[PDB]
Amino acid sequence: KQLTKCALSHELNDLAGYRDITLPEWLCIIFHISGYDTQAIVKNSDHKEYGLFQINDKDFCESSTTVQSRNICDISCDKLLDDDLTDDIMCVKKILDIKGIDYWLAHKPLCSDKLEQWYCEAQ
Numbered sequence: 570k571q572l573t574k575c576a577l578s579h580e581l582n583d584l585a586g587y588r589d590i591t592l593p594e595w596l597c598i599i600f601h602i603s604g605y606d607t608q609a610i611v612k613n614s615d616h617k618e619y620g621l622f623q624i625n626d627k628d629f630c631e632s633s634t635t636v637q638s639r640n641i642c643d644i645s646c647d648k649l650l651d652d653d654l655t656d657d658i659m660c661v662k663k664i665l666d667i668k669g670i671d672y673w674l675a676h677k678p679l680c681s682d683k684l685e686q687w688y689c690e691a692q
């Protein structure tokens with residue numbers, strides 16, 4: 570599902586604020602890593618990243634592959650590809666507690682300035 574900044578801002582209402590990561594920061598990060606596509610999959614060196622939040626199958630979700638996952642979120646990766654972000658957010662929170670926003674930023678400067686540009690209208 571290709572989401573919009575506005576529908577996504579509504580669906581992320583329970584994520585915004587967790588570990589002090591704001592809503593506009595999340596909209597910025599997600600646009601950059603998945604283009605708001607719940608079905609995004611990016612293949613990396615020794616793993617794949619799934620869904621809107623690009624959760625990897627090395628440590629976080631178990632993919633329907635031959636990859637041995639630590640599966641911290643205790644979730645199959647296919648559940649991170651549908652239009653229900655409920656479980657995705659559950660996992661995102663686990664990652665925030667473990668790795669922090671650093672999991673997404675990866676020491677890069679993206680989404681650091683003019684974040685107010687990312688609001689839907691109000692929030």
Ligand SMILES: [Ca+2]
Nearest residue numbers: 648649653654
């Ligand atoms: Ca889901």
